[PDB]
Amino acid sequence: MIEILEKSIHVLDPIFQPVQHELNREKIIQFLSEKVSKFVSNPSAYKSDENAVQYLNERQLTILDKILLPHMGQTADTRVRKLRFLGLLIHKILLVIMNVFPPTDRDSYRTKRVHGSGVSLAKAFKAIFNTSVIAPIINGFKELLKQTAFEELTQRNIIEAFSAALSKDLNRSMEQSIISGNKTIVNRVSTQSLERKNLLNTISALRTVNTHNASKQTERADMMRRVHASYPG
Amino acid sequence: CIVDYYRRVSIDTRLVQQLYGEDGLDARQLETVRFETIMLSDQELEDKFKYTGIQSPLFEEEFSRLKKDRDKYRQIFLNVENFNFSQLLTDVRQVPVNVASIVKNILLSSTSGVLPFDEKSILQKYAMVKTFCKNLPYVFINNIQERLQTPIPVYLKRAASLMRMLIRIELATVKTLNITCEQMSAILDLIRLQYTQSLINYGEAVGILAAQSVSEPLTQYMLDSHH
Amino acid sequence: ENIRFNTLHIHYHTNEIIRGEFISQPGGAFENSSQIIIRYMTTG
Amino acid sequence: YVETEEENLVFVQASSQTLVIIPDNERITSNVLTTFEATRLVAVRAQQLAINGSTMLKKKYSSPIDIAKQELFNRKIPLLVMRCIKVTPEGQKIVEIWNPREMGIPLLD
Amino acid sequence: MEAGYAEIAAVQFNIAGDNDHKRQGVMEVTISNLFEGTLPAEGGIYDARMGTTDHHYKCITCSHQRKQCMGHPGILQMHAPVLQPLFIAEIRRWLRVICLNCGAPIVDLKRYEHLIRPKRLIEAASSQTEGKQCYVCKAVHPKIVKDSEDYFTFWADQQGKIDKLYPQIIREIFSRVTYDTVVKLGRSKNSHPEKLVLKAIQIPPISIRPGIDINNVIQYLVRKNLLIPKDLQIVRGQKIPLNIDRNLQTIQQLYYNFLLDSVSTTATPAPSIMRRLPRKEGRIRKSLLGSQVWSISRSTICGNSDLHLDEVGYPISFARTLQVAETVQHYNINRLMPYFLNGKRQYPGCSRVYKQITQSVHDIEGLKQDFRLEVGDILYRDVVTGDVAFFNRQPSLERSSIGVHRIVVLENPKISTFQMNVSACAWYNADFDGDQMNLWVPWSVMSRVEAELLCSVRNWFISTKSSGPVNGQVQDSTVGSFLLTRTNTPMGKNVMNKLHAMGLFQTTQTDPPCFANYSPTDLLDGKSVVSMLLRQTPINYQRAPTWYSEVYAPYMHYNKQDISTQIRNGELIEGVLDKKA
Amino acid sequence: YETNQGRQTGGWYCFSWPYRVDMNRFFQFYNEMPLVKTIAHNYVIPNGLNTIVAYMIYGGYNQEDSVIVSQSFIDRGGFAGTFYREEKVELESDIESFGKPDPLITKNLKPGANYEKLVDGFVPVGTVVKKGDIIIGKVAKIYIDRSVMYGFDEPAVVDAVMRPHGPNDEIFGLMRLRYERNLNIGDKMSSRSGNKGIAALALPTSDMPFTEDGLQPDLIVNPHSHPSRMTNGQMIET
Amino acid sequence: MIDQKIFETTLNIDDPTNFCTNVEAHLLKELENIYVGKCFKNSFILNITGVIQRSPCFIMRTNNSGRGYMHVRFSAVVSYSSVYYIPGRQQASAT
Amino acid sequence: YAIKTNGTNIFGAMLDDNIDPYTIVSSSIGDTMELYGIEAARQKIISEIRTVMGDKGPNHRHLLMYADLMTRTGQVTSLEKAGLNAREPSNVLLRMALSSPVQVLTDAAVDSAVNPIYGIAAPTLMGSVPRIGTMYSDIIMDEKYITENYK
Amino acid sequence: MAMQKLFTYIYEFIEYRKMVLLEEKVPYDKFVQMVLNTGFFRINAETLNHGIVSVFIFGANGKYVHHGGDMRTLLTNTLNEKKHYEELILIVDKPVLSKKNILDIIVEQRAANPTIVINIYPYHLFCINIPKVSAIPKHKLITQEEAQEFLGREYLQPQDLMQISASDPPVVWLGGRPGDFVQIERPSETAMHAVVIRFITKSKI
Amino acid sequence: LRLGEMEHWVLTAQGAMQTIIEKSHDDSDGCISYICRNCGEPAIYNASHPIYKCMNCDVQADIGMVDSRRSSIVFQHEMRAANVNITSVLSPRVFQPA
Ligand SMILES: [Mg+2]
Ligand SMILES: [Zn+2]
Ligand SMILES: [Zn+2]
Ligand SMILES: [Zn+2]
Q: In whole angstroms, what is the distance from residue I7 CA to residue I41 CA?
């Protein structure tokens, strides 16, 4: 473990070389916020303004608190335990590389879930709601603030802009996600037409678990179609 | 790959095979016959095939030709067995015409039983068998060149070697004793006719045939992969 | 049919070597999950 | 679409050719019709009867395929078989012209 | 005027330069309007001179209708040159071998003079040529780079300022090169780099772009060509304004998307021209190598033990749908008359006649007054028993996958399947679990002759693959032959009286043998009747049967008269007949 | 194979079938609980019949998993039912309209099509429609013709009185075609052990083999279908 | 000025059995239907003359029409903006 | 008795003095070619294809066809597109029909390839029927028989 | 090892070439120690035409297999010997065939002296009596007039024949050149041996 | 209903043609293609409206007819639209000695 980790630490990186040997947490946070955040196209103008640097650093730390291992937590006080869990994950990976462990069985059901109707519809709905609701609303508010002064406007103007921005879509997008179910439109809605050949066919349609992946020429195609030993029952 | 008028297989004009099957035979006109001399011993070969009824070095030449053919077949197919893993020597070959069947048909259609001895007829039968075997490679050419006795190309002489072997084995004087000269001429005509019928056609798309015939067992090779 | 969330899936990269993917879902079924991919590379 | 790239390596009027005909004593192709050649001859004659209708058979037949087949069998086919494998850069076509009334006929049965 | 018969001996491929397009195109496209009335707009990208996709008019150029018109190319005179999308790699190779200012080669031609011609250009391009000196004109050669944000644009940095290599001055540079440089570099005289860049592109004929979708791409291309000023004379360093620059870039990208959209080679929303070629459903493998055909039928196959192996059961409805072309001559008018007078109403009828005097086809519903045929007429008549039909099953892996069977028309209307003998399945590797098989009846005389003389299933009885037979007795007939030929039944001796011996031969369709020598109480053996069948084709056969196996032998008592099968001249007197025989 | 075929099996496809207009749906009239049933039949309706099957050789018409079917079993209602199809067409805009076209101003009349038997642009229920008959007639440019031809060779019967109001607030045809489907020669049958078989023989009740006590089979299946597939469940079920 | 010109052409035979009975006369008949009075290959062909060379009546391969073509090399007298013998026309024009 | 090994080295075994050098039999076709010549490569190809087919395998002339095609240029050429270039470089249409039509079309255009029409794919792509069996031999109308014994 | 078998089978190869040895055969010990000593070994033979053919056996770690100038000097002075020099033969280790510099020197020398033929071969071509190998059929060169009459009977151009590389073992043992025709008696399982004629194409390097 | 690649392969393996000519040409997209034979490029011919010309070399036109398929003509047009000049050599005329 120590040998491989030291080697990995000392190996150079194409991108993060400037912060590779940096012991300053703030400098690395700012570097990452420059690299990953949009809307920062010239990472030298904001550098002079200390408040811009503060904004970028605070935004990056909030983003990482929300994004990195959120299941351990989504606040600042959980950062050490998130790093403990990340170290545990790295330990498990490098244990597998030892042949101390075997790779995860890609077809076993010890590590598989079935997500139907509710989960799939919610996962498609967040994206569809974003695109068809939040984007038109933001666009309409931006247009309204273009048309009137930021202080001049009134509450009725705000409400009318809200209601008009959504005129245009959500139903069509949801119906297309249902009807198509097409894995790249990557859609997570495993859907099939309900052919009523008989009652048994319908009830077996409602009891169907689809892999719905792609898998090229490999032993994977054969192996994932076999009857796995976790299927019984 | 298309068989041309020389029965060579050529891409456009560039050769791929000097003769289609190395024998020029259609795969649909073959039969597995037994070559009765391959497994015999020298004493057994003399007992079964050497003829003693007529004193002449001519029949000694016949038997020596038979023995030379046997030695040849043994040498080539022993080498073939050598450079392979588990392909052994067998005396059952796929030939266009089964001479034994024609002989059996003529004998069962014969007008009489065992013929009385006729030395002149025996000599005529051997001489006509020898002439037919020498003129056999003209099946790949035509009867015009056979009549003109134009030299046979070497690969055509080599193509008919197996059939010359078979004819000398089956029409040996020990087996021809009950066959008349007219019956023997009929047998020779039938052999030549079937040999002509068994030749590949000018213009056959033999590449497609080979591709299909090899790709079919690949499906079963897949199916037997799990075994 | 979906892989389990909050579970480290380590399958070999059959320039890369062994790779582990951990998809972390903060809360219930509906929370959006941020996937973190750990790679061990041939560079060391 | 990406072409999976192994990217492997390697006067518009042709000069007229004079039809040189091999003398009958130097023809090396088989004197027996191939089943392809017999089939082609029967088809060509049968279509020609379909378009013209004249015949040289003393027996009446109600179908051109039968008339053509019997014409082939009785050795009175009014068509020569031109067998040709040669074109010299010198602009010369070397063919063998075979009369099916003299060639042997394949089985066709 | 005579257009004599001819066959394409060879095909030559070349780069299509400006002159080729100029002399090939039938007209010039300068108008952006697609359609001007019902007639297409004259001079547009839909002008009738290119071709017709509707029956309402003719091509003008060829005076043919939509069926007989093959399309004709057009010329769109671009106001600025464009690079040919296919040969951008060739353009890159050419720019980096010849001097930019004078055109003479900057690499040593003597190094590649000896080399094999096609690879000379690639080795020449492999040379760096950065900062090299051109001896003949004393000009330093710059570095030619390819833009990473697109496929077509070329730059050039000479240890400094990167000027853009527009198609215009690229045409100038390529025009500077002479034939000797191209020849000595291994390229053909027709492969001059000046042909790589085009000022007058070719608009494809309407035959390949019908519509009343790539026509959209062509229309936008024409509009953007109009939006470019005609006088563009860009030199190296003209620093054209950003609007002209972006418009020329849009025009070049639009042409590139018209040709090579969604297609990436080792080089480099309507699918482009080149996307239409590859893949199974592309131009080649779906249009040329394969085809959709008329006069063809498909249905489920099913067994029928009453049909010969060389026969196929054809439902009467299909025979009424498919037609056989029989020309009316003196020898067949008598036979072909019943087909005509039956018409649409009775089987065997016919509904089509091609009158040679009118050179048109006619439906027999209106041929009551003509009432007769004549020599030189073509009559399309329903399939009848005895016709030859091609019989196919996908996948077609073997030579025997397509065989010619004789048609047996089943007049019962309730039957819609293709019926064929079980022993015939071995040709097509078919079974009757739901298989579907194709059947088309040849109609031309040549096709019928060829079918019945060469494609008849008798030719495929002996496998082309393994030189053995493919047909035989399967399942039912194998076990039946075993039962018939065995010596003893559980009731005792395996005999039958004269009546049942005759019953065996009832349904063989042959000439039944003579049982006049048998008393009504005479007991015939099974080997006896099998021999009375086999005597018609006397053969000799001597082999152990599959019924006899050493693994079984310790258990069950084999009848010694069954473990050896012997046939002498068609007289089966020994053993049983089973899979081996 | 049985898991596939039982889901392909025709039966009572929907309990509310008359209210629906479904494309290519088959409603098998008679269904039977198997003499040997399973726990699955507590939860789903069985689809099929307890046909009397004789595992015997009869003339060789049942070789290579074909089935010899009694013509009387077909006629009496065995595996019969109704097969449905639907033809729906919406107007592109207000330009179109349903109705029998006038012969003069149509300018695009179908070649040789019927165009009769239409009322107000629709073929009335209970009308037999042939391959040339025009249904849901629809003209445009209100002229020009966009009418719908039947097409199928098999004649059908019309039973649908509905011109619904679609999501775009526009009308469309949506007629339903009813087909009389007995067990024709060539229709596939299969036992619950997964032995498919194409029905190829129509033997009258007199030609069917019968036991000593008058029992005859509905289906005659070849005994050769068993040993290679080892479908002993079918034999034990019998 | 009138002059003698040698032409190459491949005919098309709609009934080869009828045609081959009197090959030479039939060939001249077909040629005078085809080429007499029309501009073709920088020439006008006033009058037809004897055929230098001909070919056996080959049967067309790529079609099932049972027709033949035959190749013909014939000399014909011609009336040879320089000049525009636009092919297929019965008169020249160099206005 | 004899030795069947895993892995191939004809050169070393030929060099070893405790084994017979004349009877080296190696599964690999490349090794057999490189140390024995194209004819021994052809024989090895026949043997390997025969082994793959097995007992049910086809007639020997088909394996002969395979080997004689793949070794007709003096080197073992594959059946993949690369072998097609090696054997038939002038047949542009055949290679376009096999795979990657765009690349080979561009290469032919820049090379100005003159493609003669032969085989099956080249005439098919040009809309003509191949010159094979029924159309291999030209049929010419019999002039003297028609003039003398007809009309 | 490759060297002793090479030593016996190279004289076997000269015997098959029907060529008379000029230099006397040294024993194996002297040959093997000289190979490391001088980096090579020279064998001279005379044809029936009475021209000199030379052979060079190079050690794997020899002087002239490592770099270019030494190789160039060796061949330049050897081809300056007053000999007829109809053919010259190089024998080098198998990876050495992939050292493009040495092949460049041999190519440029061949260009310098085109009237004689220079060839380079690996050891395995001479580590066994190749003609006596079971898997190798009986190659034999036919004379130009015999091949010409064969082609004239068949109406074949020489390039229409199947091609055989001049680097093939049995063709090298025959001494075949490009533009020569080789007749091969190959065993057959369909016709019990058959004869083909192949066209020799320039050797691959 | 399709006569695919493998059906064409099978018909070729039988040396069929004729049937191939029927099914493909005369039954799917059979057409007559005219080629100048003097320049190798497609030409224009019309028997009724007596057009006999080719754009490439106008006066020098010597059109011949080549049996083809509409798919092949469209494919050639596509290759020309990609700036690849498809020129056809055409079979040379063959004459017997005088
Ligand atoms: Mg099946
Ligand atoms: Zn047109
Ligand atoms: Zn310069
Ligand atoms: Zn032209």
A: 10
* Start-to-end Cα distance in chain B: 35
Q: How far apart are CA F136 and CA F119, in angstroms?
A: 9
CA of E101 to the centre of ligand 3 (A): 5
User: Could you tell me how far CA A73 lies from the centroid of its own chain?
Assistant: 16
The answer to whether E194 and E133 have CB atoms below 8 angstroms apart is: no
Give chain E's end-to-end CA distance (angstroms, integer): 67
Distance of CA E487 to the CA centre of its chain: 56
Measured between CA atoms, the residue of chain H closest to residue D10 is H89
Residues 156-215 (B) with a CB less than 8 A from some CB of D: 196-197, 199, 201-204
Chain H residue whose CA is closest to B93:
H60
Closest in F60, F196, F197 to E305, CB measured: F60
Find the residue in G nearest to H140 (Cα).
G58
| CB neighbour class for D21 (10 Å; exposed up to 12, middle 13-18, buried from 19) | middle
Beta-carbon separation of D27 and B142 below 8 A: yes
C1/E410 Cα distance (integer angstroms)? 52
Ligand 1 centroid distance, CA of A224 (Å)? 26
Contact residues, chain I, for B79 at CB < 8 Å: 134, 187
SS3 E448: helix
Method: cryo-EM
A149's tokens? 């002064």
Beta strands in E304-372 (DSSP E): 311-315, 323-328, 353-355, 360-362
Can you list the alpha helix ranges (DSSP code H) found in A49-207? Answer: 50-67, 79-97, 118-129, 135-147, 155-165, 170-180, 199-206
List residues bridging with E452 in a β-sheet.
Answer: none
Contact E565, E577 (CB under 8 A): yes
The answer to whether E29 and E45 have CB atoms below 8 angstroms apart is: yes
CA gap E157, A150 in Å, rounded: 49
How do E541-543 and E143-146 pair as beta strands?
A: unpaired
Nearest CA to I178 among I156, I201, I157, I198? I201
Q: Are E24 and J80 in contact (CB under 8 A)?
A: yes
Query: DSSP state, E287?
Result: I
Give the N- to C-terminal CA distance of chain J in Å, as an integer: 52
Give one DSSP letter per residue of E59-76, joined into a string. Answer: -SSS---TTT-----EEE
B103 burial (CB, 10 Å; 0-12 / 13-18 / 19+) is: buried
Alpha-carbon separation of residue A44 from A30, A47, A49, D13 (angstroms): 12, 5, 10, 70
Distance G42 CA to ligand 4 centre (A): 13
Residue carrying structure tokens 């082309």: E464
CA angle in degrees (0–180, nearest 5) for J42-J46-J51 = 85
Specify the 3-state DSSP secondary structure of I158. helix
* CA–CA separation, E390 and E442 (whole Å): 7
Judged on CB neighbours under 10 Å (0-12, 13-18, 19+), E86 is buried
Q: How far apart are CA E167 and CA E173, in angstroms?
A: 10
The terminus-to-terminus CA distance of chain H in angstroms comes to: 79
User: Residue B208 and residue J13: Cβ atoms within 8 Å?
Assistant: yes
Q: CA H83: distance to chain centroid?
A: 8
Indicate contact of J with C: 3+ CB pairs under 8 A: no
Output F170-174 pairs: Cβ under 8 A, ≥24 positions apart.
F170/F90, F170/F91, F171/F90, F171/F91, F171/F98, F172/F88, F172/F89, F172/F90, F172/F91, F173/F87, F173/F88, F173/F89, F173/F90, F173/F98, F173/F122, F173/F136, F173/F138, F173/F148, F174/F21, F174/F86, F174/F87, F174/F88
Does the annotation count F65 as an active-site position?
yes
Residue I111: its H or E element? helix I100-112
How close does chain B come to H22, measured CA to CA in Å?
9
User: Cα I147 from chain centroid?
Assistant: 22
